[PDB]
Design a protein around this ligand. Structure first.
Ligand SMILES: [Mg+2]
Ligand SMILES: [Mg+2]
Ligand SMILES: [Mg+2]
Ligand SMILES: [Mg+2]
Ligand SMILES: [Mg+2]
Ligand SMILES: [Mg+2]
Ligand SMILES: [Mg+2]
Ligand SMILES: [Mg+2]
Ligand SMILES: [Mg+2]
Ligand SMILES: [Mg+2]
Ligand SMILES: [Mg+2]
Ligand SMILES: [Mg+2]
Ligand SMILES: [Mg+2]
Ligand SMILES: [Mg+2]
Ligand SMILES: [Mg+2]
Ligand SMILES: [Mg+2]
Ligand SMILES: [Mg+2]
Ligand SMILES: [Mg+2]
Ligand SMILES: [Mg+2]
Ligand SMILES: [Mg+2]
Ligand SMILES: [Mg+2]
Ligand SMILES: [Mg+2]
Ligand SMILES: [Mg+2]
Ligand SMILES: [Mg+2]
Ligand SMILES: [Mg+2]
Ligand SMILES: [Mg+2]
Ligand SMILES: [Mg+2]
Ligand SMILES: [Mg+2]
Ligand SMILES: [Mg+2]
Ligand SMILES: [Mg+2]
Ligand SMILES: [Mg+2]
Ligand SMILES: [Mg+2]
Ligand SMILES: [Mg+2]
Ligand SMILES: [Mg+2]
Ligand SMILES: [Mg+2]
Ligand SMILES: [Mg+2]
Ligand SMILES: [Mg+2]
Ligand SMILES: [Mg+2]
Ligand SMILES: [Mg+2]
Ligand SMILES: [Mg+2]
Ligand SMILES: [Mg+2]
Ligand SMILES: [Mg+2]
Ligand SMILES: [Mg+2]
Ligand SMILES: [Mg+2]
Ligand SMILES: [Mg+2]
Ligand SMILES: [Mg+2]
Ligand SMILES: [Mg+2]
Ligand SMILES: [Mg+2]
Ligand SMILES: [Mg+2]
Ligand SMILES: [Mg+2]
Ligand SMILES: [Mg+2]
Ligand SMILES: [Mg+2]
Ligand SMILES: [Mg+2]
Ligand SMILES: [Mg+2]
Ligand SMILES: [Mg+2]
Ligand SMILES: [Mg+2]
Ligand SMILES: [Mg+2]
Ligand SMILES: [Mg+2]
Ligand SMILES: [Mg+2]
Ligand SMILES: [Mg+2]
Ligand SMILES: [Mg+2]
Ligand SMILES: [Mg+2]
Ligand SMILES: [Mg+2]
Ligand SMILES: [Mg+2]
Ligand SMILES: [Mg+2]
Ligand SMILES: [Mg+2]
Ligand SMILES: [Mg+2]
Ligand SMILES: [Mg+2]
Ligand SMILES: [Mg+2]
Ligand SMILES: [Mg+2]
Ligand SMILES: [Mg+2]
Ligand SMILES: [Mg+2]
Ligand SMILES: [Mg+2]
Ligand SMILES: [Mg+2]
Ligand SMILES: [Mg+2]
Ligand SMILES: [Mg+2]
Ligand SMILES: [Mg+2]
Ligand SMILES: [Mg+2]
Ligand SMILES: [Zn+2]
Lengths: 60, 69, 95, 107
RNA sequence: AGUUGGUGAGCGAGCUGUGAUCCGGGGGUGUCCGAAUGGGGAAACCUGGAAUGUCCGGAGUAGUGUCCGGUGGCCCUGCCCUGAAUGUAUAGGGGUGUGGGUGGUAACGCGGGGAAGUGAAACAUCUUAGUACCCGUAGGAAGAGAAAACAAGUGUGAUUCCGUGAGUAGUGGCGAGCGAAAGCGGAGGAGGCUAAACCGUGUGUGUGUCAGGUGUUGCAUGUGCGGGGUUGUGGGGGCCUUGUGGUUCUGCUGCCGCAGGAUUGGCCAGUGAGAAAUGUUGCGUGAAGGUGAAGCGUCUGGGAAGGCGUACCGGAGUGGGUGAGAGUCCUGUAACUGUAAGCGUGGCACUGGUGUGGGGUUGCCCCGAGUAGCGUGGGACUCGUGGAAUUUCGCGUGAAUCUGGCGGGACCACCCGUCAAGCCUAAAUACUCCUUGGUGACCGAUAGUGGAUGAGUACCGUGAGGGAAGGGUGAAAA
RNA sequence: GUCCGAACCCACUUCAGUUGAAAAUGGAGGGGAUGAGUUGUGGAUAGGGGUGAAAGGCCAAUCAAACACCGUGAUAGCUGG
RNA sequence: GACUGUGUGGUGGAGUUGAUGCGAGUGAGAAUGCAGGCAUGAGUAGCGUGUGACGGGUGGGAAUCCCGUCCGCCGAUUAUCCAAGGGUUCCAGGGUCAAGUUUGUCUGCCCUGGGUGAGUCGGGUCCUAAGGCGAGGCCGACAGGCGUAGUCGAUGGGUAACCAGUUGAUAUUCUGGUACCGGCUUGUCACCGCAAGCUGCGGAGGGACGCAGUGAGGUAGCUCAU
RNA sequence: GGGAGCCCAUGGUUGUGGGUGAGUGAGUGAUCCUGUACUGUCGAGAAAAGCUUCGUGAGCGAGGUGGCGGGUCCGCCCGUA
């Protein structure tokens, strides 16, 4: 996945820019990790970005 | 006669009987029209208009636009 | 509920033609009926209207004729007609 | 839309057309296209057999005529408001205001 | 006083004035399809409720076939019960029906994705162009918006939009091209809330608190709700010197003070963004209407509005009709008037609903963190990676917090400005599928809409889609 | 995936047609004709893609990249007016 | 010079002239230009495989319509009936502008009216195949992709009727005769009773399956007949 | 039930009421029936429901139902030229 279930981080779109500068469309995906979470009392998977995982916005 | 706002002076059951009688009269008129009778063609529309009037009165009573007798 | 439903709403008009009059010899009556009425409903309606025992009801759907005029093609309404067979002596007066 | 200033049964005088000066009664009015039929003026054939009867003419070609002192005088019209009472379809009463036509040149 | 729409007449009616048709406003009905929603489906069709008294109510039949009406689509969400494997518990399951959603829409808006033909006389950077198209999603407008701003030595004081600055400074295979800002002139003109200290209000738990007081008096963490507070030559909390609208006269802090208190003043302030949102009375009206001036005579003509003669009105001589060119024949026009009604609407009064601070102080306490920065790979800025500020996305890394942070085109110092990482905000601006009125040195049937007529029709195509042609008798059908 | 040979499927030769009866056929013969056969109905694969016992074949009567609409009044140092 | 007369008629029936300015969708013979109308070829090519003849009728009009008689043609189809598709072309009466490759009194044309009858036939109310859609769900920046439970989907499975007659036009449909199936209800006989039954739910059986070939017993049919 | 030519007559390109008479034997013989039979065979030849029976992970349900012969009524929608 490339969308964070927390903070809704989503891919950006930009350019491959070679030495000749012949720009080509490309994507920057967020570092989405699928981890086990225990929310309230629910065990389930969630696709969580590493930024949220580092900030602790996700309960494991 | 073609019926008017004096239908509001009647009761629900007799208004429904009026509906049934009007429907039967329209049935007879349609049969006459099919069979070649019924010189009086305007009644064939006026009976439907009367049915419309009676339903109008019944529905206003049912919806409490006019207080039910 | 408003809008009392009368059995005479289903039976619209009788069919008058040479075939219908020939079928009258067999106690058979051809009526133009409401196109959404089934054989049982037509049978019950005829019984209630005429006080007549009905042995059989046969229905067909007849397509309306299409005629090309000024303003293009016109199409006459579709009709359903019930062919009602009456008991031996009951008879129905269509005038 | 409203009605015309000329109504059926009026006595009018023809002021334009082949029959200038002819005076007759308005036999019928056709408000939609503003044409009136006055007796014994526009005699032509209909259809049907011959039917030699009156054909409509434009309402602006006639004018209401009054008898002031023994001579027929064409006149225009005005309206005055008078208090009346109208009956609702159920039969109730209420006071309302209605217009009444009067001929000019006679007050 | 006529009337039962049009193409396109006579029957049989209603109005025969018991006032219709008609006109404005508001209701009733509204088959079937369509988000389509009981289920299915080849849109406008089909088919239903396990057995029980039947899904519920009614009608019908001896009874079943039948009829009429109601009910139940899905997803989100509120409330109640239950709680799996399993222990907590959750998922799930069963109720309830609390609210919301679905789909459509001409242009305009915002956020995101994003061409190529073309130009460069080839072409790849660049251009075209963030255009076409596409995705999401609004509103009557949207977005923006109350300085982590500009300025440059004084100063300006939210934002948007228009004109300039200026085709300038710049930028650019320095090619084709691209292209500012400050300042100034205008349109329009609002500023308001919050997080945090600090104080009132429960649960992972007391053993120290003159009236009072108990191993705790009310003692310790961190919640949910109240106040309080909202700024920058810093502010706020705290600590105090005072001040709350006159009080019935309640607990607490110290028999000082604080707060609840109550009809009543009240500077005020109000249906606004403004921590909010509930009745009665004062205006002209839009939708319909009402009134609405004043010419005859002759002549020629099928016909007079034309000619000739002669009068009138004009707050009305703008038009258009009428048998030919009408100010006075018709419709109107000028001017005035009515509007009952509207969900009426706008504004006022009343009701009704909501409510103060100033001065000193700095010991202390608070001032929005995975944020700002930094590195890197991209994007937007005149700026095409560069001396690269400012701004933005992905990935890493990661601060101070007032003696602080940020900006002033690398960077540092000083100086000046400003206080980011929370939110809401009218007006000036954009637009017309529509409604009403009006206009045209605009078209006049090969034109003007594709369409003056059955026109998105006939017709062509499996389909998306393409897509015509045909107006004129006369004053009157006579 | 035998042989001869109708239906059926095919399309080798020839003649005719070639403003045709027909935008690919007709006459006469010819190949297969129990098989890798043929055919009906419904379905699946879609455009830089499909499918192809492979000819760049076929994909709605012109396919070395279908058709329709849009960018669009593309561009054309060329031709015409 | 582009052009023109304030000359004079005709046609026509409602506008428009001169002066001086102002504004242009302001001038056509060419674009294998666009639209319409009409010539040229030309009364020319063709009239789409073929066998018609005659007598009579109808009629304003007959090679081409009707009737009859001869004759010829097809006959594994030039017959009969379905499916797909078409959609009123079907029947009766009236019609001869157009259409029909000629004529036309005729028509699959035009006009008016009429015509299609099912418990059993073919589909639905039953079943699934390929495949489609798909509650949740998983996947995917968005748009979307896939798919579970399910739910659709015949070209298949399941499923009770035949012969005769009748109309200008319909017929396992109507009518006659004689059957069958499912309901409801009723009469009668027999039988049940943690322990009737009914409906759900599934288990199993069954449905349930290839191709090729020969033979046997039959019947339809056909032929012949003192 | 169907099936020819004889009838005062019909009505004269017509249909009515009577007049219908026969029904057998042999030969031949299927692409149909027994028959998804039988034999051969590799390439190994749908699904689900109806149906029969079995219980009961569900409810209903009264001591009432379920069976076998007989009687009455009900049997829908679409297509049908
Ligand atoms: Mg690009
Ligand atoms: Mg880490
Ligand atoms: Mg039927
Ligand atoms: Mg119609
Ligand atoms: Mg009224
Ligand atoms: Mg009036
Ligand atoms: Mg009325
Ligand atoms: Mg539905
Ligand atoms: Mg549906
Ligand atoms: Mg519903
Ligand atoms: Mg039930
Ligand atoms: Mg919406
Ligand atoms: Mg390019
Ligand atoms: Mg170039
Ligand atoms: Mg070039
Ligand atoms: Mg806004
Ligand atoms: Mg301000
Ligand atoms: Mg300014
Ligand atoms: Mg708080
Ligand atoms: Mg006037
Ligand atoms: Mg005059
Ligand atoms: Mg701050
Ligand atoms: Mg910085
Ligand atoms: Mg960078
Ligand atoms: Mg740039
Ligand atoms: Mg930087
Ligand atoms: Mg500097
Ligand atoms: Mg905002
Ligand atoms: Mg046009
Ligand atoms: Mg013209
Ligand atoms: Mg034209
Ligand atoms: Mg078509
Ligand atoms: Mg072989
Ligand atoms: Mg074939
Ligand atoms: Mg060849
Ligand atoms: Mg040749
Ligand atoms: Mg061979
Ligand atoms: Mg398909
Ligand atoms: Mg090759
Ligand atoms: Mg092709
Ligand atoms: Mg290409
Ligand atoms: Mg372009
Ligand atoms: Mg060009
Ligand atoms: Mg050339
Ligand atoms: Mg001039
Ligand atoms: Mg020109
Ligand atoms: Mg020319
Ligand atoms: Mg031409
Ligand atoms: Mg010629
Ligand atoms: Mg010749
Ligand atoms: Mg020649
Ligand atoms: Mg010749
Ligand atoms: Mg010839
Ligand atoms: Mg021939
Ligand atoms: Mg011939
Ligand atoms: Mg013959
Ligand atoms: Mg022969
Ligand atoms: Mg033979
Ligand atoms: Mg059909
Ligand atoms: Mg017809
Ligand atoms: Mg036709
Ligand atoms: Mg015919
Ligand atoms: Mg001809
Ligand atoms: Mg004929
Ligand atoms: Mg005929
Ligand atoms: Mg089912
Ligand atoms: Mg499936
Ligand atoms: Mg879903
Ligand atoms: Mg099912
Ligand atoms: Mg099905
Ligand atoms: Mg037939
Ligand atoms: Mg039969
Ligand atoms: Mg029968
Ligand atoms: Mg089984
Ligand atoms: Mg098997
Ligand atoms: Mg044998
Ligand atoms: Mg049929
Ligand atoms: Mg048939
Ligand atoms: Zn995240």
């Amino acid at each position: 996945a490339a969308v964070c279930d927390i903070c809704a981080k989503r891919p950006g779109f930009g350019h491959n820019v070679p030495w000749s500068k012949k720009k080509t469309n490309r994507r920057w995906s967020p570092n989405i990790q699928r981890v086990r979470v225990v929310e309230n009392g629910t065990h389930k998977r969630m696709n969580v970005c590493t930024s949220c995982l580092k900030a602790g916005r996700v309960s494991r | 006669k073609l019926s008017a706002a004096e239908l509001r002076q009647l009761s629900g059951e007799e208004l429904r009987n009026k509906v049934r009688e009007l429907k039967e009269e329209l049935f007879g008129l349609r049969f006459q029209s099919a069979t070649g009778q019924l010189e009086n063609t305007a009644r064939l529309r006026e009976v439907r208009k009367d049915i419309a009037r009676v339903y109008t009165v019944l529905q206003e009573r049912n919806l409490n636009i006019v207080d039910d007798p | 509920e408003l809008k009392i439903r009368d059995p005479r709403d289903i039976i619209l008009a009788p069919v008058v033609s040479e075939k219908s009059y020939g079928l009258l010899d067999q106690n058979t009556y051809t009526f133009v009926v409401k196109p959404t009425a089934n054989k049982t409903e037509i049978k019950i309606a005829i019984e209630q209207i005429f006080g007549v025992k009905v042995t059989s009801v046969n229905t067909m759907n007849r397509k309306g004729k299409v005629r090309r005029t000024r303003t293009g093609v016109g199409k006459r309404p579709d009709t359903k007609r019930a062919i009602v067979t009456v008991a031996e002596g009951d008879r129905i007066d269509i005038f | 839309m409203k009605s015309l200033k000329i109504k059926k049964g009026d006595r009018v005088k023809v002021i334009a057309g082949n029959d200038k000066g002819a005076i007759g009664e308005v036999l019928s009015v056709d408000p939609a296209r503003e044409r009136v039929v006055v007796e014994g003026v526009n005699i032509r054939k209909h259809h049907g057999g011959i039917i030699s009867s009156e054909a409509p003419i434009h309402v602006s070609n006639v004018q209401l005529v009054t008898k002031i002192d023994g001579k027929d005088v064409v006149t225009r019209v005005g309206y005055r408001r008078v208090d009346v009472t109208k009956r609702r379809p159920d039969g109730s009463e209420y006071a309302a205001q209605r217009s009444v036509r009067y001929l000019k040149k006679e007050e």
